[PDB]
Amino acid sequence: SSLYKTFFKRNAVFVGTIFAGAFVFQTVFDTAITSWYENHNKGKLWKDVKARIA
Amino acid sequence: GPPSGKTYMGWWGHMGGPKQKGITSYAVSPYAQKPLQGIFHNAVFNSFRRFKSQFLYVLIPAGIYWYWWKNGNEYNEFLYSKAGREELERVNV
Amino acid sequence: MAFRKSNVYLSLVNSYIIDSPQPSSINYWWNMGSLLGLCLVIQIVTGIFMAMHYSSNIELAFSSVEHIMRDVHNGYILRYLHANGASFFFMVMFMHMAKGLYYGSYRSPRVTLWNVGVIIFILTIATAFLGYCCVYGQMSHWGATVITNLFSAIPFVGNDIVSWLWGGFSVSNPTIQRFFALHYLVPFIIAAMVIMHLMALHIHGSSNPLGITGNLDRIPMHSYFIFKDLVTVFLFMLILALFVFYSPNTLGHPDNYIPGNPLVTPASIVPEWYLLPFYAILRSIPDKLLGVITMFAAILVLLVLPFTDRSVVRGNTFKVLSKFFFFIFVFNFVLLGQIGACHVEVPYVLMGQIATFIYFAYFLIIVPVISTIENVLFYIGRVNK
Amino acid sequence: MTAAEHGLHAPAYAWSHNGPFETFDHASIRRGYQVYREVCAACHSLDRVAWRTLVGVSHTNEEVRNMAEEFEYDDEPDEQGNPKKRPGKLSDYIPGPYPNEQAARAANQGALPPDLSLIVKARHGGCDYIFSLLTGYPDEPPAGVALPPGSNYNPYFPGGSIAMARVLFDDMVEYEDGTPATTSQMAKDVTTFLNWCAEPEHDERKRLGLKTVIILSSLYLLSIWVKKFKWAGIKTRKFVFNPPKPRK
Amino acid sequence: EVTDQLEDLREHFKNTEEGKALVHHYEECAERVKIQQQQPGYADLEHKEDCVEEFFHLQHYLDTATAPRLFDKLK
Ligand SMILES: CCCCCCCCCCC(=O)OC[C@H](COP(=O)(O)OC[C@H](O)COP(=O)(O)OC[C@@H](COC(=O)CC)OC(=O)CCC)OC(=O)CCCCCCCC
Ligand SMILES: CCCCCCCCCCCCCCCCCC(=O)OC[C@H](COP(=O)(O)OCCN)OC(=O)CCCCCCCCCCCCC
Ligand code: HEM
Ligand code: HEM
Ligand code: HEM
Ligand SMILES: COc1c(O)c(C)c(C/C=C(\C)CC/C=C(\C)CC/C=C(/C)CC/C=C(/C)CC/C=C(\C)CCC=C(C)C)c(O)c1OC
Ligand SMILES: CCCCCCCCCCCCCCCCCC(=O)O[C@H](COC(=O)CCCCCC)COP(=O)(O)OCCN
Ligand SMILES: COC(=O)N(OC)c1ccccc1COc1ccn(-c2ccc(Cl)cc2)n1
Numbered sequence: 001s002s003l004y005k006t007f008f009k010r011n012a013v014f015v016g017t018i019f020a021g022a023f024v025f026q027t028v029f030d031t032a033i034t035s036w037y038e039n040h041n042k043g044k045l046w047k048d049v050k051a052r053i054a
Numbered sequence: 055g056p057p058s059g060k061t062y063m064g065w066w067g068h069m070g071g072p073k074q075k076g077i078t079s080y081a082v083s084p085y086a087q088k089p090l091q092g093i094f095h096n097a098v099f100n101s102f103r104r105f106k107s108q109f110l111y112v113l114i115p116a117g118i119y120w121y122w123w124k125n126g127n128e129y130n131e132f133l134y135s136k137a138g139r140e141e142l143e144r145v146n147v
Numbered sequence: 148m149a150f151r152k153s154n155v156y157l158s159l160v161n162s163y164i165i166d167s168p169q170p171s172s173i174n175y176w177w178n179m180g181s182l183l184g185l186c187l188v189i190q191i192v193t194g195i196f197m198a199m200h201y202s203s204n205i206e207l208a209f210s211s212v213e214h215i216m217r218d219v220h221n222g223y224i225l226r227y228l229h230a231n232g233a234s235f236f237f238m239v240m241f242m243h244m245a246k247g248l249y250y251g252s253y254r255s256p257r258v259t260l261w262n263v264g265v266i267i268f269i270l271t272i273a274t275a276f277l278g279y280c281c282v283y284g285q286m287s288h289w290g291a292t293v294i295t296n297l298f299s300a301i302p303f304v305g306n307d308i309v310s311w312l313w314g315g316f317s318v319s320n321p322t323i324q325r326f327f328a329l330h331y332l333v334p335f336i337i338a339a340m341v342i343m344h345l346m347a348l349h350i351h352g353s354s355n356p357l358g359i360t361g362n363l364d365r366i367p368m369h370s371y372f373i374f375k376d377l378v379t380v381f382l383f384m385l386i387l388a389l390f391v392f393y394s395p396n397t398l399g400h401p402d403n404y405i406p407g408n409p410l411v412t413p414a415s416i417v418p419e420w421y422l423l424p425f426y427a428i429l430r431s432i433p434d435k436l437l438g439v440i441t442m443f444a445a446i447l448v449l450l451v452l453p454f455t456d457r458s459v460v461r462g463n464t465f466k467v468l469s470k471f472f473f474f475i476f477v478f479n480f481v482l483l484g485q486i487g488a489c490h491v492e493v494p495y496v497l498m499g500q501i502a503t504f505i506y507f508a509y510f511l512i513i514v515p516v517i518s519t520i521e522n523v524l525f526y527i528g529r530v531n532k
Numbered sequence: 533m534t535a536a537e538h539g540l541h542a543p544a545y546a547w548s549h550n551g552p553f554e555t556f557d558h559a560s561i562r563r564g565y566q567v568y569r570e571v572c573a574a575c576h577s578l579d580r581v582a583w584r585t586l587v588g589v590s591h592t593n594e595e596v597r598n599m600a601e602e603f604e605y606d607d608e609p610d611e612q613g614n615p616k617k618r619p620g621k622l623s624d625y626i627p628g629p630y631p632n633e634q635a636a637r638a639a640n641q642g643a644l645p646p647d648l649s650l651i652v653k654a655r656h657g658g659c660d661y662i663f664s665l666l667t668g669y670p671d672e673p674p675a676g677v678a679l680p681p682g683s684n685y686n687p688y689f690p691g692g693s694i695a696m697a698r699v700l701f702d703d704m705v706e707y708e709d710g711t712p713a714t715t716s717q718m719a720k721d722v723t724t725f726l727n728w729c730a731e732p733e734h735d736e737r738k739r740l741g742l743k744t745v746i747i748l749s750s751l752y753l754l755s756i757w758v759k760k761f762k763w764a765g766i767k768t769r770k771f772v773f774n775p776p777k778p779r780k
Numbered sequence: 781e782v783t784d785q786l787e788d789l790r791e792h793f794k795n796t797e798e799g800k801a802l803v804h805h806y807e808e809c810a811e812r813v814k815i816q817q818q819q820p821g822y823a824d825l826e827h828k829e830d831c832v833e834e835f836f837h838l839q840h841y842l843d844t845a846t847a848p849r850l851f852d853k854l855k
Contacts, residue, residue: 370762
């Protein structure tokens, strides 16, 4: 369709959109992986042991 | 600078091969064809065909050297057991 | 004309990277030279960032490397990348050299390119050896002792060479401070030999897997072989990351986490995996002087191959007998490494002797005899009377 | 070599931190430090571990400040050049029992007990060897072996004779959290604490490697797609030959 | 109350038949010895026979039969 002259054509905002998305991708990708890791290892972490030794 | 001693390869226009006459080439754009088209009919046809050819040149050597490492490692462990202490004092001298 | 062709500096980039004519039929084995160039950049960059925190004094050295691991931000990433990056650099080089041996790239008109490469290999074993000694654990001290005492057998001049190499009467502080300054230097000499290596390739260009001329069908480098090289760059980074982050000490020895002590000898002094086949060649010679000659001769017998191959065809693609003995030589090189990691005991003594002979007989007795037999078989199969 | 001079092979126990997505169990580290302080520290040093690195891992900040103040450290000299002392602070390192190697060998019949900061990484077998050693002392040595006076037998040490005697026994430590302090229980917590001492980046490293392996794995598949698209003209190109007239 | 858990499983697998096929061989060696270095010229023996090999056989089977079943019970 006409995605060409808004998405593909304009390389000025392509390289712009490549970089602008690189910054946003990092923030959400970090938060997602750190939530999966901390949940897979629930009961071993210090912040949970610290609560059990009350 | 000056020209140096010449080669067996040139550049575009004077690459240095024989003169060609009577050959025609045809091609189609990649945008006009579909990619990832047949890569099974590739890993099952051609990889298995390429394997079946060049596998007796690699595996008969591998079988001779691995058998050799075996019979040595087996014999060493016998020498340093208690049932092979008499042989050890024979061969180590 | 275009700016990329007219500018003094971009003209060299264009002629080497962009418009270079390449044979249409080269395969993925021709991608190893690109990887060896990324390897050298990884090691030089990671090493300079560690040198900011390293101390070369023999009383401070082991504890400086543990200080990079514990106190430096992301310092465990720099070391494990660096330590495992040297194991990967050597594996890609053995595959690069084995390719050229299979496809006949040593032959004329490319004899000069093969010889500059043999030099790079020697200077690269030297670099890695000097760096392992700078950790100064227990494999570091006793490995330098065994190798430096070999030069005390040279007639009438040997005990002067070891004391000048040591800076004293044993492996001590002056030895460890001079080995670090030389270890920083030699990587910049390897880089200058890599430029001379590329100049000799530009004259005749690259060969191809069929062993015939490639001047009838050529493809430019940009956007056929640049994007083919990205494929193997990302596979290299992936496998390396898997070792750095999930198994970072499997390609090492535990004794080098013990600090270096001249008064306690280890029960097994063993080199890294990539110097073991040459270490088995040395141990196989009963005499000390002949052993150190036979070990260095194992590297420089590669220069004899352009004159011992007696064939009219380049490469092994259409050669049946010469394929069988290429793979005999490869698996004989893997047994020498195994025997180099064993104790000096029956039957591993005679095994390493017979296998040291087969290493040398390949270049000097096998290749000339099978090449001549194959030539004559091609003739009588076609011309029969 | 014989099997005795090499040592007995350590088995494979199912440690809770083995795996690419696993972390250390931090309640076992906390219990392990208690076994170190009350059993091991009489004759072993821990010179490469600082007090501050325990905060947020096994103990609270207020707890660690009180443990450090129970030791005295050399201060800088006074206004007249005479030496002083002071209590410990968080930037100090965990002190050892002996002042030099001669006093250590004197108190252990000539033998020197090694520092334990890197003992898990400096031995073949890792945690499986440390655990099997402490729990491997038999009742009697096997009939025939002649030990020197002052040596003890356990088969996991190369040679068979070790200068350490058995030091672990049931219910010598009373745990704060009510765990039964059997021999194996204390050995497991000791080895877990010691592995953290050698690898204090274990948990962060395994989580940054999940990020790096996911990113690079998708770039590798995207690169295969892009290559096969840009190479499709060359792979399907066709050639025809019509022999010319040799007039020329 | 709770004894050493390893000592329990170590003690249990010594009552299987690939347990006593390794206990007895280790012993009768321990018998056979006794005499084999008791006697005269023993301080003057050349080679006195021992039993580390057969001990090792028993404690290799027993360990890699007990390794995957212990930490299930240790807290
Ligand atoms: C340490 C890490 C370094 C990183 C890179 C190392 C790569 C070295 C591997 C050796 C080599 O370079 O030659 C490999 C050779 C095949 O080369 P060829 O040009 O003849 O066949 C092109 C293909 O058909 C089309 O492959 P195509 O371009 O169509 O698709 C790409 C392919 C990716 O393959 C590669 O990355 C090649 C390394 O996509 C897939 O595989 C999809 C599955 C996810 O294969 C062989 O002839 C035998 C291979 C077995 C022996 C390897 C033992 C080495 C120790
Ligand atoms: C001092 C210097 C001494 C250095 C000694 C070098 C020893 C290093 C060992 C490196 C191993 C690499 C071996 C492969 C060599 C690369 C070149 C090669 O083998 O050619 C690939 C060949 C291609 O097939 P074709 O014959 O059909 O030709 C192409 C089509 N026109 O197809 C083949 O030949 C088969 C390819 C399969 C390769 C895998 C076989 C080896 C497997 C285990 C090797 C273990 C190494 C650790
Ligand atoms: C071809 C390039 C290089 C190679 C092959 C190489 C190889 C090595 C090796 C094998 C080690 C020992 C690894 C270990 O700790 O187990 C090492 C250590 C070291 N190297 Fe390099 N090196 C190279 C370049 C450099 C450069 C240019 C520098 C300095 C700028 C450097 C600095 C160091 C330092 C400081 C160490 C200390 C130990 C460590 O941090 O691991 N290296 N090197
Ligand atoms: C260590 C750093 C090295 C670098 C950066 C390097 C780089 C390269 C590159 C980019 C190529 C062209 C692509 C290819 O053929 O793969 C090449 C080709 C070649 N290299 Fe190297 N190389 C190195 C070491 C060596 C060594 C050690 C040898 C041999 C002992 C060697 C011998 C050759 C030969 C013979 C060719 C031509 C192969 C052919 O055209 O068929 N190089 N090198
Ligand atoms: C739970 C308590 C302890 C643990 C985990 C421990 C740990 C260790 C370790 C890992 C070794 C090294 C073994 C090897 O080199 O393979 C060792 C050796 C040694 N330990 Fe301990 N230790 C403990 C308690 C003690 C105590 C309380 C003493 C003194 C009363 C002691 C005296 C020694 C000696 C003398 C050695 C030297 C062994 C030799 O070189 O023959 N250990 N210990
Ligand atoms: C066949 O055609 C090819 C080809 O296929 C390939 C792959 C290549 C690609 C390249 C190579 C094969 C290798 C060439 C590589 C070199 C000469 C490497 C030089 C290496 C370096 C590491 C230079 C580093 C210099 C620095 C200044 C970085 C070091 C430290 C820094 C930045 C820290 C300081 C920072 C601060 C903030 C103070 C070709 O050139 C080529 O043409 C022939
Ligand atoms: C040194 C290692 C040995 C191998 C040789 C290295 C070659 C690789 C160099 C890599 C390419 C560098 C890009 C140069 C960019 C174009 C330069 C240019 O515009 O030329 C000049 C301007 O350059 C300068 O003022 C200083 C450039 C310094 C660059 C330092 C990196 C443009 O002027 P002009 O249009 O006349 O082009 C030159 C025609 N011969
Ligand atoms: C990576 O470092 C090690 O593996 N080192 O060195 C500390 C080590 C460690 C333990 C035992 C032996 C060694 C040495 O083994 C070898 C075998 C050959 N060379 C050699 C060295 C220089 C030159 Cl020019 C040519 C050949 N070195």
